[PDB]
Design a protein around this nucleic acid. Structure first.
Ligand SMILES: [Zn+2]
Lengths: 154, 128, 204, 110, 60, 78, 99
RNA sequence: CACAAGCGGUGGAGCAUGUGGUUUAAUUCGAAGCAACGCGAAGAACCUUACCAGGUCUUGACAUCCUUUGACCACUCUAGAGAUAGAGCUUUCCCUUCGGGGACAAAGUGACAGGUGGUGCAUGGUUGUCGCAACCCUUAUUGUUAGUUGCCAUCAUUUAGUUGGGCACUCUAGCGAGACUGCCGGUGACAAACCGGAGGAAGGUGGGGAUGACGUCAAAUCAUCAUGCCCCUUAUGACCUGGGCUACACACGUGCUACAAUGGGAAGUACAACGAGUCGCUAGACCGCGAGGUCAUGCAAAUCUCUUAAAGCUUCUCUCAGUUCGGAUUGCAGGCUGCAACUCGCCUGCAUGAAGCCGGAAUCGCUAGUAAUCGCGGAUCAGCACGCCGCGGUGAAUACGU
């Protein structure tokens, strides 16, 4: 705002796995406040992960998150009438925000016959350095570390 | 018998809970809690006070609930179970107090104002 | 238009209804009968300076009480005018009526009386600047925490309208426990209509 | 050929493929298939030549053909050739039921 | 014309579905409450002055 | 939908009953656009007021359930 | 029990006042009057446009509450009927005695 | 919530509705950037109704006076689209000292009435827009007084809180308590204030409402009502039937339903709150595929009814397609209110099955029980709501910075 920084919106760790990350993942799949559907979807997807060439849904999910999250994002700014873009660092909460966002967005566009057949498949493809999510990360890193040219003294 | 009674409120729903020594089970409105709130996992929200303090059994729980929806009248049940546990031994008012589990949630439905579409959503605008 | 009616903001908080009866399934008839009554007795009021009127009613009788400042000039010589009031009001209401006349003390500390009097000077070609000033002067001498007046319309019997009033002492309007009074009257000199408003603060 | 009129589709159940003949909606297909005793079983048309002739002879008792288009056509034809306020509108591409023409003709007039 | 129409309103109507309400102070035909027989903006005027018994300003 | 008997007006039905005897006249001039076309109105020529004038309409047989107002429009477009 | 009261009013002050009047003048000559039980206070709501010609998007809302009160009498006596049907005060409060 | 970070929209498609434009016998009048455009209207088939076309009246549809005087009616039958006119039993002294007064038809009789006709730039009154805190209301916790029509923990009983019993619990509603930077640590001129802790249901104006200064826009309204001046008066007044106000080469605003699998269809199982009811809300049983109908029952209401909420959950299907998506448009047959649904109502069934596969420039709403999504009630009202006012259910993302 204008007055100054604000709080961080504490979350309630889901009771099944006792992991706040699964809570945020449930919150991102959910649309229109229909939360039980989102919960059923995430649990069916994790069942599908473990049953087929899996070890545990938390482990492969964390690794997929690690492989997707970005570390260098740029910001397109305005100075006095000419606009450019400059890289900057990335604070931690924004990182997991972006990770979840990309994974869900690009699983929603897969093209199979169930959101589970999409989500489980996509985060498996992600934990093996594949999938449009990882390519989105690398597009970001390539835009950065190039557009540092008109950023070196910003 | 001995028994312990508490009252729990949340979001237009009020519950009357009774603690009774037993083997660990809960029935509500003459039905089983697996069938009354069979949603997915709200039961793991209900059994939280037993999980934090007086760990963890064994009490049969009998409750009488009315009002609100299926998700309101389970937070209300949790409220009541916590109060009843407090009644058993007053030494629990610290472990429970740390983890919420003792306060009433005063988040009610905000009232609608005139000239507005909802409590805060306004109509669509056009500068010209 | 940006002020609430000061005796409608306070009704049901520190003051009461000027009509105290409870009825259901006979409510429209009663409300219009009260309206008829009160719109009639503005006949004697034209001379006798009545301020309020309180309508109560029982099984079939109607209990009335009026606040005036002229007790004899409203009841008659030995009681020959209240007789007429009752025998006339029976012709409307078709019931039994019983006027119980009150008398008002300190009449210069009343919104309707003051404003209606200082709206009768305007009709007799009097300048307004001293009518309001003498009004608040004779309202403060009775002992009052504050008073405020305001006249509006074509002033002096002239062209385009304007407005102006004068204040004396404090008149807090936002305080709910304030017991303020208010009234709005009219008059003409020869051009259009004028509006006179008056507020008096009498402690709480 | 196939079972009525022409060409009831393949690969679908009968309760749905029977919809494709002009004059058979959804409850009519149910009633026809019930007056005989044929189910769906399961998501295919693998009938018999007794089931095809069964569900073929009963459709003959309805107006499901180019015998129905004639009826509808000559109805609107009788409408527009007496007065007629409804037919006058039928002849202009304008809503014929009372529709306050501000947008409600994009369907009726393109 | 609003003095002949109040007269025409009070005579018995020619058919069942021809009667209609009006205000009683004025003759406004739009938005009248049929518990009071008062229109939209005589209600707001007699509620102040505390003449209608019952009614007062609401807030919650 | 007056399945409790269709609706004519008395004046209109009186006039048509009165002419039911012989060959008919074009002077049946009524306002009455709410009435339906009973199966006895055939061959006559009713005049139907459309808010401005009295339009004549000749009653064939295909028009036997409709109303008398369906044959005298009121709007005048182009 | 073969005698009972009902009182409606717009002011709970006057309501409780008159209820205490009847309860006191009942237990003075008899006994066992069930307390003045409170009933759930009906409410209505009236929304109106506060301008004579335009501006629908600004309104003013009114209401009218109606307080209720119940009293049942147990074992009356040929003096309670008398000492009850006579007291009448005050004006704007509804009284309805059903056997 | 002015940008920034976000979530869902509008602009594309069909339909509802308001406005411009054109058209017409009339498409009645008002509102015009923000601050006009689901606005006056919280209910246009007749009425409403001001507008138009035909048929009619002139002290008058409505008020006072004065005189003859005085009790006026309603009902029936012919003509008429009605307005009206012509005939039939008759409007018939309710104060009496013999001497009067209330209601009223006609007439006379003229004073007079009548105007939604003009002037918001002549005005009153009533609003929009820029836009102190406390005392009042509601919501979050509890003591006490009171237990019926509410409630059922310790007991028997049945279909059941029902009937015996009880007022413990919930609930209802009167009266009180409780939140004050009030204590504890640091920052800071030791000050005000800010950051952290304890205790508590609640912590820093706890959440929301009512409450709108002096003034600005000759802002809006002579059509809520009043009113100065001007205008009409066998007509700009008044009565009746039928027609517009709903017209359609188009342009703009506000909404609803969708373009599907986080879905469509079939069967089973659950959980609210605010409100309304006497010629009204309809229990129950039966008839109809259905909307509905018949006989009948309780209730002027914590007692009966409207009222088994819908999203939700569990099974069985369907398989990425202009389709078992979507439901516009048209044909036929019905129901309900009403004297009467052609212009011009709502609902039912069978048949038909359009555009539309997430929408450019540009632009909107919102900081938490909020946004998004789902139903329920009622004012107005014979009937008629995608609009308006309220109620509750499930329930997010983000705010580095100016
Ligand atoms: Zn009025």
């Amino acid at each position: 705002p204008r007055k100054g920084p604000v709080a961080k919106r504490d979350v309630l760790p889901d009771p099944i796995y006792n992991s706040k990350l699964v809570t945020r993942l449930i919150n991102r799949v959910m649309v229109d406040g229909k939360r039980g559907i989102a919960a059923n979807i995430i649990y069916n997807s994790f069942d599908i992960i473990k049953e087929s060439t899996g070890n545990d849904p938390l482990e492969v999910f964390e690794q997929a998150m690690k492989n997707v999250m970005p570390v260098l994002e740029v910001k397109a700014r305005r100075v006095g009438g000419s606009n450019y873009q400059v890289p900057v660092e990335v604070r931690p909460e924004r990182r997991t925000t972006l990770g979840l966002r990309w994974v869900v967005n690009y699983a929603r566009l897969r093209g199979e016959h169930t959101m589970e057949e999409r989500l489980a498949k996509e985060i498996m493809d992600a934990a093996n350095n594949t999938g449009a999510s990882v390519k989105k990360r690398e597009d970001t890193h390539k835009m950065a570390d190039a557009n540092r040219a008109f950023a070196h003294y910003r | 018998q001995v028994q312990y009674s508490g009252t729990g409120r949340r979001k237009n729903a009020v519950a009357r809970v009774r603690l009774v020594p037993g083997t660990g089970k809960i029935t509500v409105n003459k039905k089983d809690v697996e069938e009354y709130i069979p949603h997915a996992d709200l039961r793991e929200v209900i059994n939280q006070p037993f999980g934090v303090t007086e760990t963890k059994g064994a009490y049969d729980v009998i409750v009488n609930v009315n009002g609100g929806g299926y998700a309101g009248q389970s937070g209300a049940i949790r409220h009541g179970i916590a109060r009843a546990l407090l009644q058993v031994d007053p030494d629990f008012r610290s472990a429970l107090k740390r983890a919420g589990l003792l306060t009433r949630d005063a988040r009610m439905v905000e009232r609608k104002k005139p000239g507005l579409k909802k409590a805060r959503k306004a109509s669509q605008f056009s500068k010209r | 238009g940006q002020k609430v009616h000061p005796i409608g903001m306070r009704v049901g908080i520190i003051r009461d209804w000027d009509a105290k009866w409870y009825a259901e399934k006979e409510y429209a008839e009663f409300l219009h009968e009260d309206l008829r009554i009160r719109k009639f007795i503005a006949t004697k009021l034209a001379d006798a300076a009545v301020s309020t009127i309180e309508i109560e009613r029982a099984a079939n009788r109607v209990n009335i009480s009026i606040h005036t400042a002229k007790p004899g000039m409203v009841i008659g010589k030995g009681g020959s005018e209240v007789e007429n009031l009752r025998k006339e009001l029976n012709k409307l209401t078709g019931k039994r009526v019983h006027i119980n006349i009150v008398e008002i003390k300190k009449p210069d500390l009343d919104a309707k009386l003051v404003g209606e009097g200082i709206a009768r000077q305007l009709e007799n070609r009097v300048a307004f600047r001293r009518a309001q000033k003498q009004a608040i002067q004779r309202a403060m001498r009775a002992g009052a925490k504050g008073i405020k007046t305001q006249v509006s319309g074509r002033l002096n019997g002239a062209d385009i309208a304007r407005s102006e009033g004068y204040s004396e002492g404090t008149v807090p309007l936002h305080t709910l426990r304030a017991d303020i009074d208010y009234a709005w009257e009219e008059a003409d000199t020869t051009y259009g209509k004028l509006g006179v408003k008056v507020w008096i603060y009498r402690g709480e | 050929a196939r079972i009525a009129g022409v060409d009831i589709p393949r690969d679908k159940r009968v309760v749905v493929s029977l919809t494709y003949i002009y004059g058979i909606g959804n409850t009519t297909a149910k009633k026809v298939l019930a007056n005989v005793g044929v189910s769906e079983d399961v998501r295919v048309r693998d009938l018999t030549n007794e089931q095809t002739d069964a569900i073929r002879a009963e459709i003959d008792k309805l107006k499901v053909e180019g015998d129905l288009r004639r009826e509808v056509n000559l109805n609107i034809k009788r409408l527009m050739e007496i007065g007629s306020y409804r037919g006058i509108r039928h002849r202009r591409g304008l809503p014929t039921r009372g529709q306050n023409t501000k947008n409600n003709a994009r369907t009726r007039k393109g | 014309a609003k003095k002949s129409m109040i007269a025409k309103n009070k005579r018995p109507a020619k058919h069942s579905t021809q009667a209609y309400t009006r205000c009683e102070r004025c003759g406004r035909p739009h938005s009248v409450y049929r518990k009071f027989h008062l229109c939209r903006i005589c209600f707001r005027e007699l509620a102040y002055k505390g003449q209608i018994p019952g009614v007062k300003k609401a807030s919650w | 939908s007056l399945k409790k008997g269709p609706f004519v007006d008395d004046h209109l039905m009186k006039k048509v009953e009165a002419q039911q005897g012989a060959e008919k006249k074009k002077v049946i001039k009524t306002w009455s656009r709410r009435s339906t076309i009973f199966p006895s109105f055939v061959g006559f020529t009713i005049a139907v007021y459309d808010g401005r004038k009295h339009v004549p309409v000749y009653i064939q047989e295909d028009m036997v359930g409709h109303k008398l107002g369906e044959f005298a429009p009121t709007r005048t477009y182009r | 029990q073969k005698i009972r009261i009902r009182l409606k009013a717009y002011e709970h002050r006057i309501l409780d006042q008159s209820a205490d009047k009847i309860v006191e003048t009942a237990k003075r000559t008899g006994a066992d009057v069930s307390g003045p039980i409170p009933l759930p206070t009906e409410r209505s709501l009236y929304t109106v446009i506060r301008a004579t010609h335009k501006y629908k998007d600004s309104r003013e809302q009114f209401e009218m509450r109606t307080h209720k009160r119940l009293i049942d009498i147990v074992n009356p006596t040929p003096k309670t009927v008398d000492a009850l049907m006579k007291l009448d005060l005050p004006s704007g409060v509804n009284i309805e005695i059903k056997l």
